[PDB]
Structure formats: structure tokens, C-alpha cells
Design a protein around this ligand. Structure first.
Ligand SMILES: Cc1cc2nc3c(=O)[nH]c(=O)nc-3n(C[C@H](O)[C@H](O)[C@H](O)COP(=O)(O)OP(=O)(O)OC[C@H]3O[C@@H](n4cnc5c(N)ncnc54)[C@H](O)[C@@H]3O)c2cc1C
Ligand SMILES: [Cl-]
Length: 468
């Protein structure tokens, strides 16, 4: 009984459809793109050309929604990288000491992650992916949405797809504002924090022996310094490759050319380690760029009127600067928020509004982590009424910087700081008395004076071939 229509078959659309099929009789996923039969790039997910970190908070939710996914990713060559034990990270506060594992991330190409999630989701035959199809309008009215009107791209024919619940997961470029304006609803409040961040990415073929058990390497901006924020990230992916993404805010954007890429990885960021490591490897692709880095949130949950049977989730409701690595985990938390409301309220007057409010809560930690750190860069453009961003800046930063600095050299503080940043714990966890006592305990290890690489990791950067 009941039917759902999901707009967009990306990460959020697949996750939400796997969940919905356990509550409704049929799910139809509408997408304007064409989908490959294997782990390939596609036009509707251009961001798959750039490094994607799947933090443990999102990975555990993906695993709850689609059992076997984590093992299938690792089984296809994805890397499980412990945090902080498997990371070499020059934070705004200095090198992170590589304490024993507190959290983890999954490292692979976004194309492999998407294919793995999609192929497992679509094993449920009550979910159908309808590709190469445009979304024309929401059916119904401002009181209740009853499906969507679509157009087949190849035939040009239009048809109505009925639904008891419509979930818009069409991503950062979602036409939700247009779809909702055509229903007669008022425009939602738009909040943005735009640092002007530009990404530049190349793929590399690293030394054959490093192809496994190599750390995630990251060189971070100092968000407190009054200069453009620049970063460099080297992440292992499947089949012996490294994806390297460099970035910079307004005034420090990376260049677009292959020859300027390595120079930026050495000299454009605060420490040259990523540039030094790519000199061991072999480039495989020319530079790809992205400007899809604005933190943008649409406050659909605060609209004065909201239709029954309509929910918006994923990048269509809240999209983040990708340097923080939260978007896929925020989408996963949002699918769980909808699932919780479905289990409490089933499908009665109020489900959609309750879910929309719960989704706003679910994305809020990722929103704060990104915006609080982007708002200070020179030339940042903002539109917000969030008092966490507009008021009490001195106090807010005092708490943030104290935890961040102490986390580099204190295992208990790092465990708490890692749990929040991977979206494995909520923001309130940081005010637990044990966390703030450890903060006051202070450092337990010296600050590293050099990148904390292990000898056994650096040894695998060379082959030894030219030696008898
Ligand atoms: C450069 C970059 C790097 C990132 N790095 C990370 C990272 O390290 N970690 C992380 O967790 N997240 C990262 N993200 C964010 C992550 O890619 C997104 O949060 C995630 O893909 C959101 O999923 P979604 O389903 O909402 O949208 P998408 O995955 O973008 O999927 C949207 C789907 O809707 C379809 N669609 C779009 N418009 C329409 C339309 N008008 N009609 C019909 N169908 C439509 C598209 O074809 C697509 O299939 C990064 C993003 C970028 C841009
Ligand atoms: Cl992109």
C-alpha cells in the first residue's frame, strides 16, 4: 500500500528510496540523467571528479540503510582509513599527533561509491529508476502534493506519476524553488556562506607498494589567519590510484593548468607535503575544477504553509563547502530523520512538515561546522540570520580554537573532536564534563615538528628496482 516518488537518483535519492521501500508498496525514482551499468562518471554527478571523504558517521548510516555496503566498498578496493591513526594532517593548529583510532573514513572514487549504493538499492524490485526523464511540475496544490508530471526525453511525451509522498533529492541544482512557486507557496528563506572556494583535482598512479595502507594526507588552511584559505588533500582510492584535490578561497584559488597544479600543492598551501608526495607518483588525468562550494541552506521547514506529502532532502535543502567532507553524511542523517518520522506518524496530516523539521535538525551540525569556519575568510559573501554566525564571535571562536588546538595533542579531546567532525556525535557532546576536563589537562604529547609519517609508509614510495 502507498506509493512514493523520489526526484533525483543520486546519493540521497538512492538512500531514501531503499528506506522508503520498507514503508511503502512502490518507489519510483525520476532522474534526467542517463545511468552507467558500471562505476563510471556521469553528467548528473559532476562532483564525482573530486575527492570524496565518507566519514564514519555517514558510513554507519549507509550501512544501516543498505546492509553490506561498507564491506562491498572495501571488497572492491576502497580503503578504510582510521582517524587520526591513518591520517597525516597539518591542521590550522599544527600537525595532528597520530593517536590510535577513534573514528574512520571510507576512501574511494565517488563513481564506485555511487555504483555500489545504486546497484544494492535497485536489487529491491519495488524500486524503479526512471532515467532520462524531466520533472515538469508537482501535482496537487499547496495543501497536498499528489505526484509529479514528467516528460520522457526520448519520446517527448508527458505523463503524471501519482504518489502519496514526493521526496525531492535533486541535489544542489534542485528546481525545488520553481516547483514550489508553481504550487503557489512562498519562497523559503535562503541562507548562504560563500567563501569563493575553487577546487582543482588530478588523479595519480602512486608507487605500486603504496597502493594499499597509505594514509589520508591533508594540509589545511588556518581559518583564523587573515589570508585566503588554501588546502591540499591526497586520498587513496581503488585500483592503486591517488586522488589529489587542492583548493583555495577568493584570492588564493588554485590555477587550472597541469604545470601549476604541483606548484600550488607545494607552495600555495601552508606545508608542501602533498606537493612532495605527488612528485613520487604519476599523473593520470588533467586538472578538473569545481566552484560548487557555497554553503547554501533553504529553510523549507520554516515556511508558513507546507504541503502534505512533500519532503526535500540532501543537497536540495542543505549543501556545504566540500572541504569539510560532510554532504553525503548529512544526506544519510536526513534519510534517518525521515525514517524516524515515518515510524512515528506513518502517513497522516503532519508527516511531511514533521519530517522537514527533523531534516533541518539533522543537517544542522554539518552546517555549523562548515559555516563557522568559512565565514571569516577575506571577501566572504554571506546571507544569514543565524545568531551563531552573526553574534558573539569572540566567545564562539575561543571555544572552537581551544578544542581544535588541544585535539592535536590530547587523545581524549581528539576522540571527542573526531566524533563530532565525522558526524558520529552531536554538537552537545563537546560540553560533556569529561571532554572539557581533558581540554584543561592539555597536551600529553609533544607537537610534531615534521609530518608524522611512518617509516614503513615512506619506504613504499620507491620500488627499489634500479638496485642490484
Ligand atoms: C567538489 C565536491 C566535493 C565533495 N566532496 C565531498 C566529500 O568529501 N564528502 C561528502 O560527504 N560529500 C562531498 N561532496 C558532497 C556530495 O557530493 C553531495 O552532498 C551529495 O552528492 C548530495 O547528494 P544528492 O543526492 O542530494 O545530490 P546528487 O548526488 O548531486 O544527485 C542529484 C541527482 O538529481 C539529478 N537531478 C539534478 N537536477 C535534476 C532535475 N532538474 N531534474 C531531474 N533530475 C535532476 C541528478 O542527475 C542526480 O542524479 C562534494 C561535493 C562537491 C561538489
Ligand atoms: Cl562539481
Amino acid at each position: 500500500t502507498r506509493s512514493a516518488v523520489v526526484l533525483g537518483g543520486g546519493m540521497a535519492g538512492m538512500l531514501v528510496s531503499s528506506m522508503l521501500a520498507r514503508h511503502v508498496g512502490s518507489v519510483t525514482v525520476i532522474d534526467r540523467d542517463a545511468f552507467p551499468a558500471g562505476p563510471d562518471l556521469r553528467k548528473g554527478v559532476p562532483q564525482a571528479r573530486h575527492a570524496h571523504i565518507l566519514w564514519s558517521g555517514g558510513a554507519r548510516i549507509v550501512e544501516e540503510l543498505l546492509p553490506g555496503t561498507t564491506d562491498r566498498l572495501l571488497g572492491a578496493g576502497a580503503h578504510r582509513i582510521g582517524i587520526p591513526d591513518g591520517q597525516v594532517s597539518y591542521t590550522a593548529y599544527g600537525w595532528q599527533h597520530r593517536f590510535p583510532e577513534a573514528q574512520f573514513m571510507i576512501a574511494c572514487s565517488r563513481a564506485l561509491l555511487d555504483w555500489t549504493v545504486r546497484e544494492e538499492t535497485l536489487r529491491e524490485e519495488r524500486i524503479a529508476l526512471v532515467e532520462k526523464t524531466e520533472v515538469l511540475a508537482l501535482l496537487g496544490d499547496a495543501g497536498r502534493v499528489t505526484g509529479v508530471r514528467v516528460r520522457d526525453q526520448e519520446s517527448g511525451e508527458e505523463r503524471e506519476v501519482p504518489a502519496d509522498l514526493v521526496v525531492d533529492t535533486t541535489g544542489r541544482g534542485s528546481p525545488s524553488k520553481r516547483l514550489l512557486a508553481e504550487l503557489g507557496l512562498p519562497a523559503p528563506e535562503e541562507e548562504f556562506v560563500d567563501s569563493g572556494m575553487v577546487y582543482a583535482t588530478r588523479l595519480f598512479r602512486a608507487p605500486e607498494a603504496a597502493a594499499t595502507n597509505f594514509p589520508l594526507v591533508s594540509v589545511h588552511a588556518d581559518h583564523r589567519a587573515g589570508r585566503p584559505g588554501c588546502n591540499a588533500v591526497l586520498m587513496p582510492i581503488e585500483d592503486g590510484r591517488w586522488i589529489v584535490t587542492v583548493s583555495g578561497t577568493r584570492g588564493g584559488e588554485p590555477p587550472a593548468d597541469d604545470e601549476g597544479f604541483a606548484r600550488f600543492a607545494r607552495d600555495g598551501v601552508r606545508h608542501p607535503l602533498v606537493g612532495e608526495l605527488i612528485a613520487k607518483a604519476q599523473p593520470l588525468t588533467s586538472v578538473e575544477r569545481s566552484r560548487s562550494t557555497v554553503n547554501r541552506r533553504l529553510h523549507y521547514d520554516r515556511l508558513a504553509t507546507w504541503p502534505e506529502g512533500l519532503v526535500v532532502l540532501g543537497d536540495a535543502v542543505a549543501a556545504f563547502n566540500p572541504v569539510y567532507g560532510h554532504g553525503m553524511s548529512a544526506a544519510a542523517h536526513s534519510v534517518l530523520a525521515l525514517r524516524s518520522q515515518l515510524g512515528q506518524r506513518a502517513f497522516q496530516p503532519g508527516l511531511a512538515r514533521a519530517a522537514q523539521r527533523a531534516i533541518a535538525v539533522a543537517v544542522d551540525d554539518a552546517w555549523v561546522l562548515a559555516t563557522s569556519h568559512d565565514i571569516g575568510y577575506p571577501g566572504c559573501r554571506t546571507q544569514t540570520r543565524d545568531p551563531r554566525l552573526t553574534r558573539h564571535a569572540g566567545e564562539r571562536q575561543r571555544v572552537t580554537d581551544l578544542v581544535g588546538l588541544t585535539a592535536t595533542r590530547n587523545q581524549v579531546v581528539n576522540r571527542a573532536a573526531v566524533a563530532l567532525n565525522t558526524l558520529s556525535a552531536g554538537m552537545a557532546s563537546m560540553q560533556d564534563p569529561a571532554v572539557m576536563a581533558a581540554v584543561r589537562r592539555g597536551p600529553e604529547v609533544p607537537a610534531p615538528t615534521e609530518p608524522p609519517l611512518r617509516p614503513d609508509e615512506v619506504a613504499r614510495l620507491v620500488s627499489g628496482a634500479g638496485v642490484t
